Amino acid sequence: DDLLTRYRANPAMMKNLKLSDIRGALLKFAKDQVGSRFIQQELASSKDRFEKDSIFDEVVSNADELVDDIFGNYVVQKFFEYGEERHWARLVDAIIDRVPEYAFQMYACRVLQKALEKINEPLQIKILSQIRHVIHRCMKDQNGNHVVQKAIEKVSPQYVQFIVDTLLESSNTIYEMSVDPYGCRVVQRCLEHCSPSQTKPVIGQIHKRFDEIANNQYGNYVVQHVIEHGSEEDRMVIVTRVSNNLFEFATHKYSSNVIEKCLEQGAVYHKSMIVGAACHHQEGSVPIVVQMMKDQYANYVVQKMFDQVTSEQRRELILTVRPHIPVLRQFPHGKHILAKLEKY
RNA sequence: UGUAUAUA
């Protein structure tokens, strides 16, 4: 008979198990799927604040074994959730040596994010100082990107300055990160949480390779974030570049959502640019918008246009489209959205 | 009719 074995077989014990009852058996309970679930329930439900201190020192001394365990990491997280600063400082001091490794570990990175989510700034910088040694590799790792995201999300901009320095360290880093499946999220968090003096260099690097980023499966989300969290001059430059090349940007899988973001977030003169190019620029002897309506992707942009655009700019679209309606009805995407646009 | 977002 063993306390863990007895609890798994009969959780509803005659004397209901508390955390102080598993004293000396923390590691066995924490590494068990059912046992860890018990600690999570009591750490979240027990009104006796002193009950969690009976196992806490066992959690600290075995933190190097629990933070990267398939079940033990939930126990460590709950002490950041329901513990206080005295609990945080001891947990951080216990895991700080292998933070350069925990950031890349599937379960251990969850603990690091929860810590940055809950703890105070001095303890946040403690974890942040250990990320400095692996920041470049950590930024585009399958697990480490979520650690870098939470740091940008939860600590002051002047403390993530070394991350912005890493993104600008080389001429191509911003592009590589923008087209990376994990690194593109670090660029996104920076675009909405960093200071203007940090975002302005990064945004300027996005404009240096705007065309390659805008049609990238991940970089298009980066361009969309510059549209939403950028300055007035940033949307202007973006809306001019997409309007200068509307057809190719609307007829491609990923860059088509960029023009929808321009239409969703743009001012009147921004949409006037998009409408003017769609109506008055040609794609094979016929207006851009007419060829857009028979395209598999650009028809969504025409839908987005007609719904987000001024009624007067909508009249310019209607007059441009009307004489081409018999031509469009012969195309499957043309007849499809002509039906959804029969409203006009 | 068309895009990313991780643990039992």
Side-chain angles (χ1 to χ4, degrees), chain A residues 91-114:
Chain A
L91 278 164
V92 172
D93 267 336
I95 76 171
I96 195 64
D97 268 15
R98 314 191 325 200
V99 163
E101 291 103 55
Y102 292 154
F104 301 88
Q105 281 160 18
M106 161 175 43
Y107 312 114
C109 75
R110 298 288 188 150
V111 173
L112 271 54
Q113 311 181 232
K114 191 55 71 70

mmCIF file of all heavy atoms in Angstrom, chain A residues 91-114:
data_model
loop_
_atom_site.group_PDB
_atom_site.id
_atom_site.type_symbol
_atom_site.label_atom_id
_atom_site.label_comp_id
_atom_site.label_asym_id
_atom_site.label_seq_id
_atom_site.Cartn_x
_atom_site.Cartn_y
_atom_site.Cartn_z
ATOM 1 N N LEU A 91 10.492 30.062 -6.334
ATOM 2 C CA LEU A 91 10.341 29.280 -7.557
ATOM 3 C C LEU A 91 11.300 29.767 -8.635
ATOM 4 O O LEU A 91 11.958 28.965 -9.309
ATOM 5 C CB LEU A 91 8.897 29.353 -8.053
ATOM 6 C CG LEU A 91 7.875 28.415 -7.411
ATOM 7 C CD1 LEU A 91 6.465 28.887 -7.723
ATOM 8 C CD2 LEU A 91 8.083 26.986 -7.887
ATOM 9 N N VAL A 92 11.390 31.087 -8.814
ATOM 10 C CA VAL A 92 12.260 31.646 -9.848
ATOM 11 C C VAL A 92 13.718 31.318 -9.546
ATOM 12 O O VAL A 92 14.471 30.891 -10.428
ATOM 13 C CB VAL A 92 12.036 33.163 -9.976
ATOM 14 C CG1 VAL A 92 13.067 33.774 -10.912
ATOM 15 C CG2 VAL A 92 10.628 33.449 -10.472
ATOM 16 N N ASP A 93 14.133 31.506 -8.290
ATOM 17 C CA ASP A 93 15.505 31.184 -7.909
ATOM 18 C C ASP A 93 15.813 29.704 -8.107
ATOM 19 O O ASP A 93 16.975 29.335 -8.312
ATOM 20 C CB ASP A 93 15.757 31.582 -6.453
ATOM 21 C CG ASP A 93 16.342 32.975 -6.321
ATOM 22 O OD1 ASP A 93 16.970 33.454 -7.289
ATOM 23 O OD2 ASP A 93 16.178 33.590 -5.246
ATOM 24 N N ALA A 94 14.791 28.848 -8.056
ATOM 25 C CA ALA A 94 15.000 27.412 -8.184
ATOM 26 C C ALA A 94 15.125 26.952 -9.631
ATOM 27 O O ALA A 94 15.732 25.906 -9.883
ATOM 28 C CB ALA A 94 13.857 26.653 -7.504
ATOM 29 N N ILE A 95 14.568 27.699 -10.585
ATOM 30 C CA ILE A 95 14.577 27.309 -11.991
ATOM 31 C C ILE A 95 15.441 28.218 -12.846
ATOM 32 O O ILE A 95 15.581 27.963 -14.051
ATOM 33 C CB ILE A 95 13.146 27.250 -12.562
ATOM 34 C CG1 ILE A 95 12.613 28.662 -12.813
ATOM 35 C CG2 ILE A 95 12.224 26.487 -11.622
ATOM 36 C CD1 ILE A 95 11.298 28.695 -13.563
ATOM 37 N N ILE A 96 16.037 29.263 -12.265
ATOM 38 C CA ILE A 96 16.722 30.274 -13.061
ATOM 39 C C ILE A 96 17.973 29.734 -13.746
ATOM 40 O O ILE A 96 18.387 30.273 -14.780
ATOM 41 C CB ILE A 96 17.061 31.495 -12.182
ATOM 42 C CG1 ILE A 96 17.429 32.702 -13.049
ATOM 43 C CG2 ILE A 96 18.173 31.165 -11.196
ATOM 44 C CD1 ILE A 96 16.292 33.194 -13.919
ATOM 45 N N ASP A 97 18.580 28.671 -13.214
ATOM 46 C CA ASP A 97 19.838 28.187 -13.773
ATOM 47 C C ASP A 97 19.645 27.587 -15.161
ATOM 48 O O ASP A 97 20.511 27.734 -16.031
ATOM 49 C CB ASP A 97 20.472 27.163 -12.832
ATOM 50 C CG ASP A 97 21.439 27.794 -11.852
ATOM 51 O OD1 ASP A 97 21.412 29.034 -11.704
ATOM 52 O OD2 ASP A 97 22.227 27.051 -11.231
ATOM 53 N N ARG A 98 18.519 26.912 -15.390
ATOM 54 C CA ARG A 98 18.265 26.233 -16.654
ATOM 55 C C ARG A 98 17.135 26.880 -17.447
ATOM 56 O O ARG A 98 16.502 26.219 -18.275
ATOM 57 C CB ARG A 98 17.976 24.755 -16.405
ATOM 58 C CG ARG A 98 18.949 24.123 -15.438
ATOM 59 C CD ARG A 98 18.820 22.613 -15.404
ATOM 60 N NE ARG A 98 17.444 22.177 -15.585
ATOM 61 C CZ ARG A 98 16.999 20.977 -15.228
ATOM 62 N NH1 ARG A 98 17.806 20.116 -14.622
ATOM 63 N NH2 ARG A 98 15.735 20.652 -15.434
ATOM 64 N N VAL A 99 16.867 28.166 -17.200
ATOM 65 C CA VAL A 99 15.954 28.911 -18.072
ATOM 66 C C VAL A 99 16.441 28.927 -19.514
ATOM 67 O O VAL A 99 15.608 28.793 -20.424
ATOM 68 C CB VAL A 99 15.704 30.314 -17.499
ATOM 69 C CG1 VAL A 99 15.111 31.236 -18.559
ATOM 70 C CG2 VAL A 99 14.784 30.234 -16.292
ATOM 71 N N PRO A 100 17.739 29.084 -19.810
ATOM 72 C CA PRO A 100 18.186 28.951 -21.210
ATOM 73 C C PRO A 100 17.784 27.640 -21.865
ATOM 74 O O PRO A 100 17.707 27.581 -23.100
ATOM 75 C CB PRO A 100 19.709 29.076 -21.102
ATOM 76 C CG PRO A 100 19.916 29.953 -19.928
ATOM 77 C CD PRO A 100 18.829 29.588 -18.949
ATOM 78 N N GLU A 101 17.519 26.590 -21.089
ATOM 79 C CA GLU A 101 17.025 25.327 -21.621
ATOM 80 C C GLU A 101 15.511 25.200 -21.525
ATOM 81 O O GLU A 101 14.884 24.653 -22.438
ATOM 82 C CB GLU A 101 17.678 24.151 -20.889
ATOM 83 C CG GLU A 101 19.158 23.979 -21.179
ATOM 84 C CD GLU A 101 20.036 24.484 -20.050
ATOM 85 O OE1 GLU A 101 19.854 24.025 -18.903
ATOM 86 O OE2 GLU A 101 20.906 25.342 -20.308
ATOM 87 N N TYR A 102 14.914 25.697 -20.438
ATOM 88 C CA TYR A 102 13.471 25.574 -20.251
ATOM 89 C C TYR A 102 12.691 26.297 -21.341
ATOM 90 O O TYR A 102 11.582 25.879 -21.691
ATOM 91 C CB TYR A 102 13.071 26.119 -18.880
ATOM 92 C CG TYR A 102 13.566 25.295 -17.715
ATOM 93 C CD1 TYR A 102 13.772 25.874 -16.471
ATOM 94 C CD2 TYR A 102 13.825 23.940 -17.859
ATOM 95 C CE1 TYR A 102 14.221 25.126 -15.401
ATOM 96 C CE2 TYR A 102 14.276 23.183 -16.796
ATOM 97 C CZ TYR A 102 14.473 23.782 -15.569
ATOM 98 O OH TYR A 102 14.920 23.034 -14.504
ATOM 99 N N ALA A 103 13.251 27.382 -21.886
ATOM 100 C CA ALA A 103 12.538 28.153 -22.899
ATOM 101 C C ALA A 103 12.259 27.326 -24.147
ATOM 102 O O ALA A 103 11.287 27.594 -24.863
ATOM 103 C CB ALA A 103 13.335 29.407 -23.260
ATOM 104 N N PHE A 104 13.085 26.318 -24.420
ATOM 105 C CA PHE A 104 12.924 25.470 -25.593
ATOM 106 C C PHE A 104 12.201 24.165 -25.295
ATOM 107 O O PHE A 104 12.024 23.350 -26.206
ATOM 108 C CB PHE A 104 14.292 25.162 -26.215
ATOM 109 C CG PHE A 104 15.058 26.383 -26.637
ATOM 110 C CD1 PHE A 104 15.888 27.040 -25.743
ATOM 111 C CD2 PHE A 104 14.954 26.869 -27.929
ATOM 112 C CE1 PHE A 104 16.596 28.163 -26.128
ATOM 113 C CE2 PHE A 104 15.660 27.990 -28.320
ATOM 114 C CZ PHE A 104 16.482 28.638 -27.419
ATOM 115 N N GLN A 105 11.783 23.941 -24.054
ATOM 116 C CA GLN A 105 11.138 22.697 -23.660
ATOM 117 C C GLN A 105 9.622 22.851 -23.698
ATOM 118 O O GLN A 105 9.079 23.872 -23.269
ATOM 119 C CB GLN A 105 11.597 22.268 -22.265
ATOM 120 C CG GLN A 105 12.972 21.613 -22.254
ATOM 121 C CD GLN A 105 13.630 21.640 -20.888
ATOM 122 O OE1 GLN A 105 12.967 21.835 -19.871
ATOM 123 N NE2 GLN A 105 14.942 21.442 -20.859
ATOM 124 N N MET A 106 8.947 21.819 -24.215
ATOM 125 C CA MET A 106 7.511 21.905 -24.472
ATOM 126 C C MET A 106 6.727 22.196 -23.198
ATOM 127 O O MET A 106 5.866 23.082 -23.174
ATOM 128 C CB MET A 106 7.026 20.609 -25.123
ATOM 129 C CG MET A 106 5.529 20.373 -25.020
ATOM 130 S SD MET A 106 5.003 18.899 -25.916
ATOM 131 C CE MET A 106 6.298 17.747 -25.461
ATOM 132 N N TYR A 107 7.011 21.458 -22.124
ATOM 133 C CA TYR A 107 6.284 21.677 -20.877
ATOM 134 C C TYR A 107 6.900 22.802 -20.056
ATOM 135 O O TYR A 107 6.174 23.578 -19.423
ATOM 136 C CB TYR A 107 6.242 20.386 -20.057
ATOM 137 C CG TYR A 107 5.828 19.167 -20.849
ATOM 138 C CD1 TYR A 107 6.720 18.128 -21.077
ATOM 139 C CD2 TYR A 107 4.544 19.054 -21.369
ATOM 140 C CE1 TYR A 107 6.347 17.011 -21.799
ATOM 141 C CE2 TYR A 107 4.161 17.942 -22.094
ATOM 142 C CZ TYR A 107 5.068 16.923 -22.305
ATOM 143 O OH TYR A 107 4.694 15.812 -23.026
ATOM 144 N N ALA A 108 8.231 22.912 -20.057
ATOM 145 C CA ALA A 108 8.889 23.911 -19.224
ATOM 146 C C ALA A 108 8.628 25.327 -19.715
ATOM 147 O O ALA A 108 8.620 26.266 -18.910
ATOM 148 C CB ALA A 108 10.391 23.642 -19.162
ATOM 149 N N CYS A 109 8.419 25.511 -21.022
ATOM 150 C CA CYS A 109 8.107 26.847 -21.517
ATOM 151 C C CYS A 109 6.751 27.320 -21.013
ATOM 152 O O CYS A 109 6.545 28.526 -20.843
ATOM 153 C CB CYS A 109 8.161 26.880 -23.046
ATOM 154 S SG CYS A 109 6.765 26.104 -23.886
ATOM 155 N N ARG A 110 5.828 26.393 -20.749
ATOM 156 C CA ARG A 110 4.542 26.770 -20.170
ATOM 157 C C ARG A 110 4.721 27.411 -18.800
ATOM 158 O O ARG A 110 4.029 28.379 -18.463
ATOM 159 C CB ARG A 110 3.632 25.547 -20.071
ATOM 160 C CG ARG A 110 3.293 24.922 -21.409
ATOM 161 C CD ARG A 110 2.331 25.801 -22.182
ATOM 162 N NE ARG A 110 1.845 25.151 -23.393
ATOM 163 C CZ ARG A 110 0.648 25.370 -23.926
ATOM 164 N NH1 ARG A 110 -0.188 26.225 -23.352
ATOM 165 N NH2 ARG A 110 0.286 24.736 -25.032
ATOM 166 N N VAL A 111 5.644 26.880 -17.995
ATOM 167 C CA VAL A 111 5.901 27.451 -16.675
ATOM 168 C C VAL A 111 6.464 28.860 -16.802
ATOM 169 O O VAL A 111 6.065 29.773 -16.069
ATOM 170 C CB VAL A 111 6.847 26.534 -15.876
ATOM 171 C CG1 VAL A 111 7.265 27.199 -14.571
ATOM 172 C CG2 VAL A 111 6.183 25.190 -15.611
ATOM 173 N N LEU A 112 7.392 29.060 -17.743
ATOM 174 C CA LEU A 112 8.021 30.366 -17.906
ATOM 175 C C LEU A 112 7.006 31.426 -18.317
ATOM 176 O O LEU A 112 7.064 32.568 -17.846
ATOM 177 C CB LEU A 112 9.149 30.279 -18.936
ATOM 178 C CG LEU A 112 10.558 29.921 -18.450
ATOM 179 C CD1 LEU A 112 10.572 28.624 -17.652
ATOM 180 C CD2 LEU A 112 11.516 29.833 -19.628
ATOM 181 N N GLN A 113 6.065 31.067 -19.195
ATOM 182 C CA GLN A 113 5.033 32.019 -19.596
ATOM 183 C C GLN A 113 4.105 32.350 -18.436
ATOM 184 O O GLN A 113 3.747 33.516 -18.237
ATOM 185 C CB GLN A 113 4.232 31.466 -20.774
ATOM 186 C CG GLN A 113 5.081 30.945 -21.908
ATOM 187 C CD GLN A 113 4.252 30.438 -23.064
ATOM 188 O OE1 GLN A 113 4.436 29.311 -23.520
ATOM 189 N NE2 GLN A 113 3.340 31.270 -23.553
ATOM 190 N N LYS A 114 3.699 31.338 -17.666
ATOM 191 C CA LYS A 114 2.836 31.586 -16.517
ATOM 192 C C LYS A 114 3.544 32.438 -15.470
ATOM 193 O O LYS A 114 2.918 33.279 -14.816
ATOM 194 C CB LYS A 114 2.372 30.260 -15.914
ATOM 195 C CG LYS A 114 1.261 30.397 -14.884
ATOM 196 C CD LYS A 114 0.067 31.152 -15.450
ATOM 197 C CE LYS A 114 -0.681 30.321 -16.482
ATOM 198 N NZ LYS A 114 -1.402 29.176 -15.859
#
